[PDB]
Amino acid sequence: NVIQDLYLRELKDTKLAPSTLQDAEGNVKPWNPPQKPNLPELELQGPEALKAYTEQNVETAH
Amino acid sequence: EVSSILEERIKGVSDEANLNETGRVLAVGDGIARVFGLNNIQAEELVEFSSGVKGMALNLEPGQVGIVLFGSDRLVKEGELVKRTGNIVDVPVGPGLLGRVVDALGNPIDGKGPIDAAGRSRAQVKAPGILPRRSVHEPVQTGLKAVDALVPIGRGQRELIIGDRQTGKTAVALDTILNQKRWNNGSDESKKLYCVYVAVGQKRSTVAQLVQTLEQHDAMKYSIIVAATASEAAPLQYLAPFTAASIGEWFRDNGKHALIVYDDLSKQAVAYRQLSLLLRRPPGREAYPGDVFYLHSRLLERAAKLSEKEGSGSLTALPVIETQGGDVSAYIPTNVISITDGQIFLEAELFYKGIRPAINVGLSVSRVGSAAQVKALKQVAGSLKLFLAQYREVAAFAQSDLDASTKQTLVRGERLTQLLKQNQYSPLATEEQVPLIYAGVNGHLDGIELSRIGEFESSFLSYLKSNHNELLTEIREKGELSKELLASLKSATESFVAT
Amino acid sequence: VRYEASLRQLEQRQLAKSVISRVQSELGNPKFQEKVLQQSISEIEQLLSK
Amino acid sequence: AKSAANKLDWAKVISSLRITGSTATQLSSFKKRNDEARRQLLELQSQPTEVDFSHY
Amino acid sequence: STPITGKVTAVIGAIVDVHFEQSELPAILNALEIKTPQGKLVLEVAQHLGENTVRTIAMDGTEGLVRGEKVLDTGGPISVPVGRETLGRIINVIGEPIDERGPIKSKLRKPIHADPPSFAEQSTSAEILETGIKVVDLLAPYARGGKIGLFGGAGVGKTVFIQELINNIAKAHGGFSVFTGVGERTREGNDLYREMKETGVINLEGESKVALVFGQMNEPPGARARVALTGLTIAEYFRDEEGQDVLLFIDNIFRFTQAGSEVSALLGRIPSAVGYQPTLATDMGLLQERITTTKKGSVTSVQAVYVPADDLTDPAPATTFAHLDATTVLSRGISELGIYPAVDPLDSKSRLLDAAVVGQEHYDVASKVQETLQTYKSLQDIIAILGMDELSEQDKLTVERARKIQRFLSQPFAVAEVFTGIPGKLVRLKDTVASFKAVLEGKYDNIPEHAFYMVGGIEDVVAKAEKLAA
């Protein structure tokens, strides 16, 4: 009686709706782009490198 | 869409008025609702709630009748109807549970195929008479060479598979189900064992491998898997071996055979313990109930090989018992060991030593054993017991160098031992077990290096199929070796050993 | 792909809660009187037969 | 290239025999090889960037 | 009508009884809340004793519970927060932040209980974890879907083992994780929290790669029990709705077993298995089934486990051994010997090890290892009494390779820079298979034992042959 009655009103006035795109989007992973590769590692730049490498290995040994 | 299917189902549900006797929960705790009313009610009869939980009535007493709840404690409250269905626990039995994984309740949990039923038979019944019996003499081939010869297998013949934890207990058992595919393929239905694997208090993850492996080898069209999992409650686990055996009874009564592999009674006991302790039943050995014995005994005495009158059928059984490092002196192993006729005892050492299966066949005996054994296999492996038997005791002598005698025994034993090391999940026919063992016995395999044993096995088999597959088919179907086949069988081994 | 799969389930779940929504209307409306009585008389017919 | 680096390292192993100490000969040879092997497996993981709008 | 009033009737430790009014009709698994100076004491109804009177377990202090003090009825289990914004925050057992940065962000909430996924939902493994630890990787590797268990005694570096796996594996994989701490010391929490903040696994902005759920042992026995149910629920949310693999971690899961045992006697449930809860199988069973691979996510737990009295033939570990897929065994002796980790070579076993799943070469190599060590251990007896020169030449050589192998298990870790002080190594699965093989084939018995001591991958083994010579 009541099972049928309740179910008719609910089925008729409310179908299967797909969600909004906006609601879906939020609930999924965002997408971020790639940021900054890298600048290779310094080991002095300028003539700071030049004077220093030449002076440090002047020594050799027997 | 989906709603339509559901719409179909909704209409098929109506208001139901009439209901019989009832009770109302007074207090519910720990899965033990305690009910007021249910005066006249059968012993261990089924009750259905108003919240749709099921129960059984272990306790009947006049003040309160103490229901034991199977499901949730969250749908059961105070002051709730408990309708008396009026039917003691019974579950459907049919032929339709072939290829069907069912829960403890008998419904498909894999979601494949309907249950074609014909009757519902009680989970507990009583074991047939003395006159409903006939001696055990029917072989059964497991596909492992060692088990079939040293401690043969039979029909309505139960004998343990008691061993240590994750040492390939399941591999000893699985090989047999896969071997029962052989009879199934033909059409003599008095040779068809319709296997049942009963996973009790064993999780759904483990079982998912169990089903997967069956499916790959096309063995879910006669295997039945009754499951009461680790998560599923103590009534379901307590009632899982009783539900499974009962399915087997339909087959058995119609004149057929079927086979039940229980895994594991170590877990059946644990569930009875949970039930006893919450209903405050008497204590016993090791803190498991004292009355556990009675439980196991009732289940194991229905596994029997019946008279020809009862159609010439049986319920063959193979319980699997989980040990805590090889303890057999433990209260639950000890009960089962006395009840059943035979044991197989797997060993941890063999496992570590890279021999898998790690079945150890010296400490295996079958009480009834070889009365059920193929004639062919008895001739070529009587010898085989006496050769391996000496080698164990003479392997208590270890290397520098030894007597001329002692060293010989090790050479013979060891080639045989590597022969009986086999890969798992690989069954064998009667026509390919019988030639190999004869090679060992007659010392054409024990004249050949250890390393080359594994090689020898396949080559010799192929060599026999190419030259004379007539002798193999003859061997198989006669079931026995005649002097004309025994002449030939030596001749053949010689040409093969030459190459 | 996961959420699309999830969505077919959700759609049914929205209809579950909808049953609750008609339930509210029944107890507000004189369905609260009339259907309780549809229920009562059927119980009278069944119980007379016992 | 990468093989020139690895040939040149073996010239440097026998060089470190002739001088005393090999304080940054070794530290240099190890760094060069190492970060060369790392960029190579890094590249095997690297695919061009595409989105499959005709399957998913 | 449902009363919103209960008056407390008996405080006997953690057990708190309430006297609800007319019409209440109590239901198990509800949550009662009592206003208290220490917040809101949560009570999880675990019995009704009849006539509107529950017997409940406390999740907060009862050293200030006043009798006669009003007890509201909240209903069902408590609801924690789940999401992806629930990562890299420290969440209490009652669901509240002890990391003190406003509330733990939500979208949706679910309760600490969940029904276990049905047979139809279950699906198999197909991915193979690689930990980067040479002993685990050759003799028992884990696979996603698995319920890994780190069995050992005390002093075998239990936290350190658990720490190692986060240092490597956690960064590597594309999924998020959940770290759950069950009943552990105030030192250990802080050690985990600092070390991984620095390593960037914990970040103050959400959407991390771990979660933190610290439940501690100076909280009543019921809280220690339901810290685990709380963290687990975050992982189910990942798995199903947000469709991401989890590499869950729980610590120490004996505090979960031991906790149930405490409130078991007092609730009336007389001990079984000798000193343990009679509900040991089912509580485990429910817990383990939630952690699995289904139609979407694969939640592969790494669980610490404590073996009491260093004896693993005792009923509490033995029951568990069944429940876990990929056991390892650790011991005091191995750790002290200088062999890191203390994992034993023959006792590390998986039910996920197949000869095809890990490939034929791998399988054959790990079997040879299992044999050579086992001959070594049989020979120990002979060598003790008889002497080492009354061994055959085949035997003597197996002793020798087995010694090389035995010291080829030793690899230092970064999180065991409190022992050796030498950072960790990453060792690829193929590199373990190839270097062990070489020893066994007899082509790499030119290498001494100490050059397999303290090495990474293959490249390392070669590098150490040169160093010792000079």
Curated annotation (Swiss-Prot), chain A:
Present with 6140 molecules/cell in log phase SD medium. Belongs to the ATPase h subunit family. F-type ATPases have 2 components, CF(1) - the catalytic core - and CF(0) - the membrane proton channel. In yeast, the dimeric form of ATP synthase consists of 17 polypeptides: alpha, beta, gamma, delta, epsilon, 4 (B), 5 (OSCP), 6 (A), 8, 9 (C), d, E (Tim11), f, g, h, i/j and k. It is found in: Mitochondrion; Mitochondrion inner membrane. Keywords: ATP synthesis, CF(0), Hydrogen ion transport, Ion transport, Membrane, Mitochondrion, Mitochondrion inner membrane, Transit peptide, Transport. GO terms for biological process: cristae formation; mitochondrial proton-transporting ATP synthase complex assembly; proton motive force-driven ATP synthesis; proton transmembrane transport. The chain holds residues 33 to 94 of 124 of the full protein. This is ATP synthase subunit H, mitochondrial. It comes from the Eukaryota. The keyword NADP does not apply. GO terms for cellular component: mitochondrial inner membrane; mitochondrion; proton-transporting ATP synthase complex.
Curated annotation (Swiss-Prot), chain B:
It is found in: Mitochondrion inner membrane. The record marks S364 as: Required for activity. GO terms for biological process: proton motive force-driven ATP synthesis. ATP binds at G163, D164, R165, Q166, T167, G168, K169, T170. It comes from the Eukaryota. The modification Phosphoserine is found at S14, S135. The keyword Membrane applies. GO terms for molecular function: ADP binding; ATP binding; proton-transporting ATP synthase activity, rotational mechanism. F-type ATPases have 2 components, CF(1) - the catalytic core - and CF(0) - the membrane proton channel. CF(1) has five subunits: alpha(3), beta(3), gamma(1), delta(1), epsilon(1). CF(0) has three main subunits: a, b and c. Belongs to the ATPase alpha/beta chains family. This is ATP synthase subunit alpha, mitochondrial.
Swiss-Prot record, chain C:
It comes from the Eukaryota. It is found in: Mitochondrion; Mitochondrion inner membrane. Disulfide bonds: none annotated. Belongs to the eukaryotic ATPase B chain family. Present with 12900 molecules/cell in log phase SD medium. Mitochondrial membrane ATP synthase (F(1)F(0) ATP synthase or Complex V) produces ATP from ADP in the presence of a proton gradient across the membrane which is generated by electron transport complexes of the respiratory chain. F-type ATPases consist of two structural domains, F(1) - containing the extramembraneous catalytic core, and F(0) - containing the membrane proton channel, linked together by a central stalk and a peripheral stalk. During catalysis, ATP synthesis in the catalytic domain of F(1) is coupled via a rotary mechanism of the central stalk subunits to proton translocation. F-type ATPases have 2 components, CF(1) - the catalytic core - and CF(0) - the membrane proton channel. In yeast, the dimeric form of ATP synthase consists of 17 polypeptides: alpha, beta, gamma, delta, epsilon, 4 (B), 5 (OSCP), 6 (A), 8, 9 (C), d, E (Tim11), f, g, h, i/j and k. This is ATP synthase subunit 4, mitochondrial. The gene is ATP4.
From Swiss-Prot, chain D:
Keywords: Acetylation, ATP synthesis, CF(0), Hydrogen ion transport, Ion transport, Membrane, Mitochondrion, Mitochondrion inner membrane, Transport. One of its GO terms (cellular component) is mitochondrion. One of its GO terms (molecular function) is proton transmembrane transporter activity. It is found in: Mitochondrion; Mitochondrion inner membrane. It comes from the Eukaryota. One of its GO terms (biological process) is proton motive force-driven ATP synthesis. Present with 6820 molecules/cell in log phase SD medium. F-type ATPases have 2 components, CF(1) - the catalytic core - and CF(0) - the membrane proton channel. In yeast, the dimeric form of ATP synthase consists of 17 polypeptides: alpha, beta, gamma, delta, epsilon, 4 (B), 5 (OSCP), 6 (A), 8, 9 (C), d, E (Tim11), f, g, h, i/j and k. Belongs to the ATPase d subunit family. This is ATP synthase subunit d, mitochondrial. It comes from Saccharomyces cerevisiae (strain ATCC 204508 / S288c) (Baker's yeast). The gene is ATP7. The chain holds residues 4 to 59 of 174 of the full protein.
